[PDB]
Design an enzyme around this catalytic site. Structure first.
Site, PDB file in Angstrom:
ATOM      1  N   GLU A 182       0.672  -1.230   0.024  1.00  0.00           N
ATOM      2  CA  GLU A 182       0.099   0.007   0.166  1.00  0.00           C
ATOM      3  C   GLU A 182       0.818   1.202  -0.001  1.00  0.00           C
ATOM      4  OE1 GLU A 182      -2.234  -0.522   3.541  1.00  0.00           O
ATOM      5  OE2 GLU A 182      -3.330  -2.280   2.879  1.00  0.00           O
ATOM      6  N   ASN A 225       1.736  -5.062  -3.577  1.00  0.00           N
ATOM      7  CA  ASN A 225       0.231  -5.243  -3.039  1.00  0.00           C
ATOM      8  C   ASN A 225      -0.426  -4.048  -2.507  1.00  0.00           C
ATOM      9  OD1 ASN A 225      -1.653  -7.480  -2.362  1.00  0.00           O
ATOM     10  ND2 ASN A 225      -1.437  -6.469  -0.393  1.00  0.00           N
ATOM     11  N   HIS A 232     -10.717  -5.819  -1.454  1.00  0.00           N
ATOM     12  CA  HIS A 232     -11.651  -5.839  -0.455  1.00  0.00           C
ATOM     13  C   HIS A 232     -12.715  -4.942  -0.945  1.00  0.00           C
ATOM     14  CE1 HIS A 232      -8.878  -7.415   2.537  1.00  0.00           C
ATOM     15  NE2 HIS A 232      -8.211  -6.298   2.469  1.00  0.00           N
ATOM     16  N   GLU A 240      -6.355 -10.516  -0.958  1.00  0.00           N
ATOM     17  CA  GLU A 240      -7.163 -10.351   0.271  1.00  0.00           C
ATOM     18  C   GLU A 240      -8.563 -10.101   0.237  1.00  0.00           C
ATOM     19  OE1 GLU A 240      -5.203  -7.308   2.763  1.00  0.00           O
ATOM     20  OE2 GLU A 240      -3.210  -7.787   1.991  1.00  0.00           O
ATOM     21  N   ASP A 267     -12.396 -10.281   0.086  1.00  0.00           N
ATOM     22  CA  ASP A 267     -13.569 -10.345   0.791  1.00  0.00           C
ATOM     23  C   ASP A 267     -14.985  -9.311   0.269  1.00  0.00           C
ATOM     24  OD1 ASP A 267     -12.882  -7.863   1.703  1.00  0.00           O
ATOM     25  OD2 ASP A 267     -11.630  -8.818   3.703  1.00  0.00           O
ATOM     26  N   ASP A 320     -43.712 -25.988  -6.968  1.00  0.00           N
ATOM     27  CA  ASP A 320     -44.763 -24.954  -7.017  1.00  0.00           C
ATOM     28  C   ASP A 320     -45.376 -24.530  -5.621  1.00  0.00           C
ATOM     29  OD1 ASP A 320     -47.781 -24.917  -6.540  1.00  0.00           O
ATOM     30  OD2 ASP A 320     -47.873 -24.775  -8.803  1.00  0.00           O
ATOM     31  N   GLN A 379     -44.913 -27.910  -3.295  1.00  0.00           N
ATOM     32  CA  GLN A 379     -45.010 -29.281  -3.645  1.00  0.00           C
ATOM     33  C   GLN A 379     -44.379 -29.021  -5.064  1.00  0.00           C
ATOM     34  OE1 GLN A 379     -49.136 -29.366  -4.417  1.00  0.00           O
ATOM     35  NE2 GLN A 379     -49.051 -27.558  -5.922  1.00  0.00           N
TER      36      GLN A 379
HETATM   37  O1  LIG Z   1     -55.289 -26.312  -8.391  1.00  0.00           O
HETATM   38  C1  LIG Z   1     -54.312 -27.248  -8.228  1.00  0.00           C
HETATM   39  C2  LIG Z   1     -52.968 -26.811  -8.613  1.00  0.00           C
HETATM   40  O2  LIG Z   1     -53.183 -26.036  -9.933  1.00  0.00           O
HETATM   41  C3  LIG Z   1     -51.846 -25.250 -10.259  1.00  0.00           C
HETATM   42  O3  LIG Z   1     -52.113 -24.445 -11.437  1.00  0.00           O
HETATM   43  C4  LIG Z   1     -51.292 -24.612  -9.397  1.00  0.00           C
HETATM   44  O4  LIG Z   1     -50.007 -24.110  -9.832  1.00  0.00           O
HETATM   45  C5  LIG Z   1     -50.807 -25.428  -8.077  1.00  0.00           C
HETATM   46  O5  LIG Z   1     -50.242 -24.702  -7.039  1.00  0.00           O
HETATM   47  C6  LIG Z   1     -52.134 -25.889  -7.651  1.00  0.00           C
HETATM   48  O6  LIG Z   1     -52.181 -27.050  -6.464  1.00  0.00           O
END
Ligand SMILES: OC[C@H]1O[C@@H](O)[C@H](O)[C@@H](O)[C@@H]1O
Ligand SMILES: OC[C@H]1O[C@@H](O)[C@H](O)[C@@H](O)[C@@H]1O
Ligand SMILES: OC[C@H]1O[C@@H](O)[C@H](O)[C@@H](O)[C@@H]1O
Ligand SMILES: OC[C@H]1O[C@@H](O)[C@H](O)[C@@H](O)[C@@H]1O
Lengths: 436, 436
Positions: free
Chosen positions: B128, B170, B207, B236, B238, B325, B338
């Site tokens: 430096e 450096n 840095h 160095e 980060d 989803d 799900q």
């Molecule tokens: O209605 C049943 C399913 O429809 C789909 O279009 C949705 O993205 C889901 O989240 C839902 O569970």
């Protein structure tokens, strides 16, 4: 005096409190915030069973009185916490069962309430008596094993000990109506009322987190208990993540139920929380107001008289008529924002997140590179620093959480290209913003 | 191999190092991570001037040798930090000036390099020496006041002291090519190369923070110095907020330059950082790998067989052929995710942020309600908890930062409505995901 939580709450006849820890009363930053913001106090641990009766028949109120004295000295009412509970029992009580335990429970209530007779607004007579297994039945503890009637006995004992205090049953995970626990508690209070068992309130701890999230049906829960002829109170409020929306939602739920006496958040600063890792309170370690503090204060004050900018939107300066703009729609970290003619452009669509960030492009954040006046306000990769958190004041000003400073159009400039900086809030038109 | 940063870096003939603090070498949590992930070591403080020559003529290499030996014994080369610097000089040196200081500087270089002769891969000979005032000139220090040629002399002395060591200059804030400081250092190195001054490398501390943000032109800077005939090294590193993109960008910049020897991050865990408050490293205090860690590892391993996500998109399960989803496009906190036939709907559009979050609806985050097998994966208000941060592995699995567990379709289910949970990573098809 709508500038503090307590004063704002009082505008609807309610109180706003916190949990006080005696060992923190010597911390000026702590007491300054606590005395200014709340008008109700609960001793976080000092009035519990192990703290008030260290040995059987030997009461000790030194710690509790420090909290109590501080509260009254600073104009606050007090919620007593707590007289009968399965947790944090002193060793001598943990070893008890049957009738010996039952009498010890009775003697403890008499002793503690006798000491505070006529000085306590609310007492959490019984705390957390229901199970979390999922069926909503009684929690199996030494207290429950003395007989199912122990709760009723505790309440009848409390009424006799101090008829001036409101008697509350306090518990957690009883905010969502669909939960069996919530319903088990409802059935008990209903039974008490029907049989003349003296109970005046139900305290909803309201410890919200992704494991037991807040749900809008909370309002019906409160309405349901209120209909039984008892008052309701949010006793230990804290929200994992401190979502501005959730904090305002809970506040509005209480304001919608006439029998909701008020709200108590479980702690002052996140660093004081029993769950600091969740940064679930309204003030951060620095003692500064979080985005959630403003959401709560605004909700208590009635909130904006217009629909909040859902799904992002423009931020137009009142004193210039121009919108917050990222120069040339650049996504380069360090690009200072400016004022510019408003129009349908992604580089002008800001979204305020529940965490208090002002995002653009989806993952870029209004960022302050410093805390003093003149500090450049730019865009930077979002990461959650307090220098990326903002409070949307009802007066149209936008304040930086970390700096406590207002977004300011430099030199009061008003034409396109006017840069944005941080500056001591002046209530100026160049510091005022109207969203669209 | 390619499961650790060091090994991954080695595939291209580079290294990935860290700064080691001798006081933490007695901490197994610290050493476990350090010995495994890095193949280059820089002593954080043990090889500085004040630490090696407490009094003029009296050298102390105990602490320095401790770090050096631990490095070599564990398969790491070492970067010497540092020989000539205006900061952290022992008291006696701070008082010297003119010819006497010049001689002390030379004697120090000779004493330290002589001790480690032939054992140091790279030496930060001069550290430096340029100002941050925007002039692009030398900073005014006792060393500079001894004559503008001090830097050149330091390097000539070093080469003689140990010709097997690569000699580096450096500095920090010399990454953004447009900055005057960068130009100042560039001109110097250029001059040295033309005049035959013995300099082999330039170290860029790197840095980055909202004050001195990373800019894509960092690659241009690296390429520009490389063109001068000197090697370059990120010394160095980060990043404030530990942005995944920025960490990966810096990594790709080095990989894009044949002369970039490797990358060293300034510390192991965020809690070991000189700037812990900015959580700028690759490991959390609890030792868990952060989103950026995996982003860096993926870059070192050649990225992916196909272009990465530009924010916003579906996440399809390999075994099911269905997408992540949020049921009925609900926005309610606690809603478990799900699998469901893929389609154009916001409840299937996830954006991976630099902080490691997987956002939906703009402000909802894929959330893990716990850390054990079977933990429910849902959506919850975004706040930044580690249970809301994920790592996108190149093998297709998605690992929770806090839990170290994988997204898992319950029971290997493939039908619509199959729930998502956390579970020990098994490389199963119900734990691997891809882009639609
Ligand atoms: O209605 C049943 C399913 O429809 C789909 O279009 C949705 O993205 C889901 O989240 C839902 O569970
Ligand atoms: O190029 C001039 C201006 O044009 C506007 O459309 C952009 O939104 C501004 O960011 C830009 O500075
Ligand atoms: O002159 C210093 C500052 O004074 C404030 O009142 C103005 O709002 C700022 O724009 C200005 O930069
Ligand atoms: O054994 C139970 C678990 O086994 C794992 O291999 C599967 O991936 C999980 O979905 C399942 O719940």
């Amino acid at each position: 005096a709508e500038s503090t939580l307590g004063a704002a709450a009082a505008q609807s006849g309610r109180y706003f409190g916190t949990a006080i820890a005696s060992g923190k009363l010597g911390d000026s930053a702590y007491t300054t915030i606590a005395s200014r913001e709340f008008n109700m106090v609960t001793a976080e641990n000092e009035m519990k069973i192990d703290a008030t009766e260290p040995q059987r028949g030997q009461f000790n109120f030194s710690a509790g009185d420090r909290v109590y004295n501080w509260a009254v000295q600073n104009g606050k009412q007090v919620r007593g916490h707590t007289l009968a509970w399965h947790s944090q029992q002193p060793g001598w009580m943990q070893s008890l069962s049957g009738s010996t335990l039952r009498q010890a429970m009775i003697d403890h209530i008499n002793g503690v309430m006798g000491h505070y007779k006529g000085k306590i607004a609310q007492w959490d007579v019984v705390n957390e008596a229901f199970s979390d297994d999922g069926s909503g039945g009684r929690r199996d503890s030494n207290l429950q094993r003395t007989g199912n009637d122990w709760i009723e006995v505790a309440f009848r004992t409390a009424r006799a000990a101090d008829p001036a205090a409101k008697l509350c049953y306090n518990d957690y995970n009883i905010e969502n109506w669909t939960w069996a626990k919530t319903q088990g508690v409802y059935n008990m209070v209903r039974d008490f009322k029907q049989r003349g068992v003296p109970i005046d309130c139900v305290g909803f701890q309201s410890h919200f987190n992704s494991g037991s999230p807040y749900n809008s049906n909370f309002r019906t829960t409160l309405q349901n208990f209120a209909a039984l002829g008892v008052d309701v109170a949010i006793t230990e409020l804290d929200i994992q993540g401190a979502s501005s929306s959730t904090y305002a939602a809970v506040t509005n739920d209480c304001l919608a139920v006439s029998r909701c006496l008020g709200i108590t958040v479980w702690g002052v600063r996140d660093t004081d929380s029993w769950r600091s890792g969740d940064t679930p309170l309204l003030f951060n370690g620095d003692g500064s107001k979080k985005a959630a503090y403003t959401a709560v204060l605004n909700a208590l004050n009635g909130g904006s008289s217009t629909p909040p900018p859902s799904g992002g939107g423009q931020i137009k300066g009142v004193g210039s008529g121009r919108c917050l703009d990222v120069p040339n729609a650049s996504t380069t970290d360090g690009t200072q924002v400016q004022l510019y003619d408003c129009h349908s452009a992604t580089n002008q669509q800001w979204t305020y997140t529940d965490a208090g960030e002002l995002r653009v492009y989806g993952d870029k954040c209004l960022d302050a590179a410093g805390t003093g006046n003149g500090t450049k306000v730019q865009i930077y990769s979002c990461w959650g620093g307090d220098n990326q958190k903002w409070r949307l004041n009802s007066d149209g000003s936008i304040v930086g959480v970390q700096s406590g400073l207002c977004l300011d159009a430099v030199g009061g400039g008003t034409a396109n290209g006017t840069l944005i900086q941080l500056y001591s809030c002046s209530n100026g038109s160049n510091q005022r913003w109207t969203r669209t």
